[PDB]
Design a binder for these strands. Structure first.
Ligand SMILES: [Mg+2]
Ligand SMILES: [Mg+2]
Lengths: 828, 142, 8
RNA sequence: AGGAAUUCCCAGUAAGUGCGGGUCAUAAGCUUGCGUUGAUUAAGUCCCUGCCCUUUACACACCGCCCGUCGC
């Protein structure tokens, strides 16, 4: 009864994930040869000319969200949706530094020019600056109120500027960690932010056609710097600005909208601007001969010019630019990476290695070497060991497909009522049959190598046989509703179909007659499978339950919770009564049909799973998901014991009196030290509370004492510290702050040590200073309150004098009395 | 966008320790607690303390109306009464009595200011009685 | 209800 | 004259002693009344082992905002 573990071996069929950013990398001294692309939880580096993956960088259970290469080029920073930041060494391929300050998906990373500091932005409204060399986090900035879009350093005076999904741009002083300037120009999200022209111009992209620009000048009064609205340049795209980027030490400004076309802009600077101004002035002089402020204004608008815009096959997610001719690399929704060259032509594509859409159907060959995956408009064949695409065919669509017993041919179903045949060697379509009126949903292979069965949206179910390879229809069975799935018995005796109404009906193969009906699902059954013995059939529905039935009498053995959403596909292992299931809950589970028990959970994918396949030997399992990826699992020799695996899922100060003496002791030590420091001229606690006098530090300790615990803490306090505290109390009264608390403290010490204080002659000067200060300060505080007493009383009498004038007199008196009547609780 | 610009200026002035200028803006923004923290910081600093009454005269009329109704709440708390009474002192001495009657809400504010003031005066009176103990110790000194 | 919503 | 561990106990209380009854249940080498002699130490803290609660009647006087997470 011992079970075995399935382990995820490799990931294939992915070129580039839709979320993320594409970046060039420098390997072996070739800047433009290699590119780094993000996939599901992993990041891949490709060689565009060869078309091969040089190396893969390992990930851990979380999708990668954004990329940033280090300025030196040895390292590239990786951010994930969890919030962990990991930096990978390109040559070694292993990253050993982990940064996990953030609590949400990481939006952007950026390096400074030297590479010593790293800035991270996340959807949570925080900015964290990390020390790259020391592998520590310096400080956190919390000003923004929405997700962070872009964060950029300033080289000249160590300033950071950030933009967010909220309609604000915030400037930060890194030395003091303070936000000194805020821009409120825009009305909508600030999606893009770039620095240009040696940190003298600012560019922002918003959800509007116009593109604004500012000029920055270095020094409600402005602080540190000032910015003015320089102007605006128009965009051809009428949609939001997805990306703004500027090539490193380059003159190309790139604007990208939601549409596929990518817009490029070229700046004019240094002598080029001056030469253009001189040419314009000469042209104006020539016009004057034929027959200024306007010319200068014309020069300002033409400071940046529009070069021809590059167009791509489909919409772009992320792009990167490099300048030596401009080389631009792109990423699309299709997992396709393209490069274009312009001073536009497409120089290469890496379309090979992945389908252009979601792979909906998945099949294995009769032998285990070959793996068939098909999607919309594509069919590909994979070698199981090598993991390379053998051959590709264009198809109308793919919903169902089986591998014919001949190793040479393949058969697929379409969402249109068509069926197609291909050879692996020929790579051509044999013929196209109008098999069904509607969409063909399911199709099954008979144990004897002759024939196959088709069912689809058209209410009939049709039988076909193989006849160069061709197929013909023998007989059809007509139903009341459409058929979601057909599953054919291991022997030629039974045939099973699933209908729109929540029932599975079994028909005799030979005579096409009713034999049983299986009901009890709230929602229609999507997937079915029958074991090799034929005793058991498992049905999974849109409702989360899966049910096991006996074929002999149609009795339900068990009903299982299974997934948290609709189950998508089901299939038994070949040897025994163990089946694999897949649902929209991002998970894969396997069950023992005999013991009705859940053995394992596979947790590779990150999106809902469309299809699954298991090898005829049963050793290998391949699955497909909404994320454009394909994963392979292999059975391992290590035994699996259930309750241990069940256990794995379960697993996955100082007293008041004591403070006073320490405060006094700290005061004594510092005064001796500062005495010595001045002598030379001719602690951490202090800066912890902010730089203050040592005398001041004791004052808050007195404030920190609770009111109730005040008297006994002073009573416990020894007489050795009494001479010092009396001196310190004298300073506190003279400042005039917190007089009452010190006076209450002072008078308590004098009474309790009245006998001892009199004897000591050293304390005579202290009491003389205390005597003068105490009465002098208390009187002044009382006099200020006393003066307010007289002033307020006079104003009270004037208001009452006015009231008598109005005194209809009875009504006014009643209103006055009603105003001055309060209500109290009383036990009568 | 106006508040955040005004908010940005206030934070800069607090960061620069410019409490005298920051006093004006926080009153206009209707921040009672922030002003209360500013007033305490002014009195701790020596040079700012004497220039407090000079600054208070430069305020326009509506700022004085808002600040006066701030003193009513502060005077209620025994911990916060001292700076509340300090502000009220400038109001009574500098400004004309007939002009105090011109303020808005002065009648309602005057109702609450008196009873808490009598409590504070009595409490300081008892401290003066206790403070005389210093003289008794001095004569018994050897 | 249609199978397109459920399976496709 | 009964180790290691462990149980119980604050005033007519711990401990010793005698004298009766068998009472519609229980009780026989046991069970329950009655009297006599009558002590040492302690009257207080949350330190350990824990238990029960709370952190939203405006005399005078005193005091002056518990914190965090996930769901809707
Ligand atoms: Mg014994
Ligand atoms: Mg006895």
């Amino acid at each position: 009864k011992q079970y075995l573990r399935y382990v995820a071996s490799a990931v294939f069929g992915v070129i580039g994930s839709q979320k993320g950013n594409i970046v060039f990398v420098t390997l072996r001294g070739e800047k433009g040869r290699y590119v780094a692309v993000p996939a599901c939880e992993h990041v891949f580096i490709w060689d565009l000319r060869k078309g091969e993956k040089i190396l893969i960088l390992q990930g851990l259970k979380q999708e990668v969200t954004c990329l940033c290469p280090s300025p030196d080029g040895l390292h590239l920073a990786v951010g994930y949706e969890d919030g962990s930041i990991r930096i990978f060494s390109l040559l070694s391929g292993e990253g050993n530094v982990t940064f996990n300050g953030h609590k949400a998906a990481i939006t952007t990373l950026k390096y400074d020019q030297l590479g010593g500091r790293l800035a991270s932005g996340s959807k949570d409204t925080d900015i964290i600056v990390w020390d790259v060399i020391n592998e520590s986090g310096l400080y956190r900035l919390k000003g923004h109120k929405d997700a962070i879009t872009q964060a950029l350093f300033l080289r000249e005076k160590n300033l950071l500027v950030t933009s967010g999904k909220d309609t604000m741009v915030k400037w930060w002083d890194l030395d003091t960690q303070h936000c000194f300037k805020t821009m409120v120009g825009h009305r909508t999200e600030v999606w893009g932010l770039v620095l240009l022209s040696e940190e003298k111009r600012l560019i922002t992209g918003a959800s509007d056609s116009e593109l604004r620009v500012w000029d920055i000048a270095y020094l409600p009064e402005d602080r540190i710097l000032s910015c003015r609205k320089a102007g605006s340049i128009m965009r051809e795209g009428r949609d939001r600005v997805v990306n703004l980027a500027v090539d490193k030490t380059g003159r190309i400004l790139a604007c990208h909208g939601t549409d596929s076309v990518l817009e490029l802009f070229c700046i004019l600077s240094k002598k080029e601007i001056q030469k253009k101004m001189d040419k314009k002035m000469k042209k104006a002089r020539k016009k004057a001969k034929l027959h200024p402020e306007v010319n200068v204004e014309m020069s300002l608008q033409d400071e940046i010019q529009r070069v021809t815009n590059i167009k791509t096959s489909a919409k772009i997610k992320s792009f990167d630019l490099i300048h030596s001719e401009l080389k631009a690399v792109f990423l699309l929704q299709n997992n396709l990476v393209e490069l274009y060259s312009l001073n536009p032509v497409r120089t290469s594509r890496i379309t090979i290695g992945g389908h252009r859409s979601d792979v909906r159907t998945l099949s294995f060959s009769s032998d285990n070497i070959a793996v068939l995956s098909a999607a919309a408009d594509s069919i590909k064949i994979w070698n199981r060991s090598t993991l390379q695409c053998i051959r590709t065919m264009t198809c109308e669509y793919a919903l169902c497909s089986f591998f014919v017993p001949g190793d040479r041919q393949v058969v697929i179903g379409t969402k249109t009522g068509k069926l197609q045949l291909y050879d692996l060697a020929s790579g051509n379509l044999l013929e196209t049959i109008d098999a069904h009126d509607g969409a063909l949903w399911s199709m099954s292979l008979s144990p004897d190598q002759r024939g196959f069965v088709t069912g689809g949206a058209d209410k009939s179910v049709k039988f076909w046989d193989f006849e160069r390879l061709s197929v013909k229809q023998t007989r059809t069975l007509q139903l009341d509703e459409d058929v979601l799935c057909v599953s054919y018995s291991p022997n030629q005796k039974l045939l099973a179909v699933s209908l729109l109404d929540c029932t599975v009906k079994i028909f005799y193969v030979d005579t096409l007659k009713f034999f049983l009906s299986l009901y009890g699902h709230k929602l229609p059954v999507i997937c079915m499978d029958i074991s090799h013995d034929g005793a058991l059939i498992a049905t999974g529905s849109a409702d989360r339950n899966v049910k096991i039935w006996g074929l002999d009498f149609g009795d339900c053995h068990k009903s299982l919770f299974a997934h948290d959403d609709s189950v998508m596909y089901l299939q038994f292992v070949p040897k025994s009564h163990l089946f694999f299931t897949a649902g929209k809950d991002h998970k894969i589970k396997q069950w023992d049909a005999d013991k009705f028990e859940h053995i394992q959970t596979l947790e590779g994918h990150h999106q809902e799973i469309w299809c699954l396949a298991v090898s005829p030997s049963g050793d290998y399992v391949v699955s497909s998901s909404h994320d454009k990826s394909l994963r392979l699992w292999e059975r391992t020799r290590e035994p699996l014991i259930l309750e241990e695996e069940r256990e794995m899922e379960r697993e996955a100060t100082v007293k008041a009196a004591e403070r006073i003496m320490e405060a006094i002791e700290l005061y004594r030590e510092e005064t001796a030290k500062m005495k010595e420091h001045k002598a030379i001229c001719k602690n951490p606690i202090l800066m912890a509370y902010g730089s203050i006098s040592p005398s001041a530090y004791v004052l808050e300790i007195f404030k920190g004492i609770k009111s109730s615990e005040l008297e006994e803490s002073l009573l416990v306090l020894p007489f050795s510290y009494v001479p010092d505290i009396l001196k310190l109390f004298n300073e506190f009264i003279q400042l005039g702050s917190d007089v009452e608390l010190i006076c209450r403290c002072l008078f308590f010490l004098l009474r309790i040590h009245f006998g001892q204080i009199t004897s000591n002659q050293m304390l005579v000067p202290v009491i003389e200073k205390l005597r003068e200060t105490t009465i002098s300060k208390v009187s002044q505080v009382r006099d200020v309150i006393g003066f307010n007493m007289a002033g307020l009383d006079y104003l009270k009498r004037e208001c009452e004098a006015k009231s008598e004038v109005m005194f209809s007199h009875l009504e006014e008196k009643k209103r006055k009395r009603k105003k001055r009547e309060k209500l109290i609780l009383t036990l009568t | 966008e106006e508040q955040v610009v005004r908010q940005q200026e206030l934070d800069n002035l607090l960061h620069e320790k410019r409490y005298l200028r920051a006093l004006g803006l926080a009153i206009s923004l209707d921040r009672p607690h922030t002003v209360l923290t500013v007033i305490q910081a002014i009195r701790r600093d020596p040079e700012a303390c004497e220039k407090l009454e000079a600054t208070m005269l430069r305020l326009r009329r509506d700022q004085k109306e808002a600040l006066l109704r701030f003193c009513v709440t502060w005077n209620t708390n025994s911990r916060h009464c001292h700076e509340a009474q300090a502000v009220l002192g400038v109001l009574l001495r500098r400004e004309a009595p007939e002009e105090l009657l011109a303020y808005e809400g002065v009648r309602a504010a005057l109702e609450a200011l008196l009873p808490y003031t009598e409590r504070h005066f009595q409490r300081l009176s008892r401290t003066l009685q206790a403070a005389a103990f210093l003289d008794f110790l001095w004569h018994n000194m050897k | 209800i249609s199978v397109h919503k459920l399976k496709l």
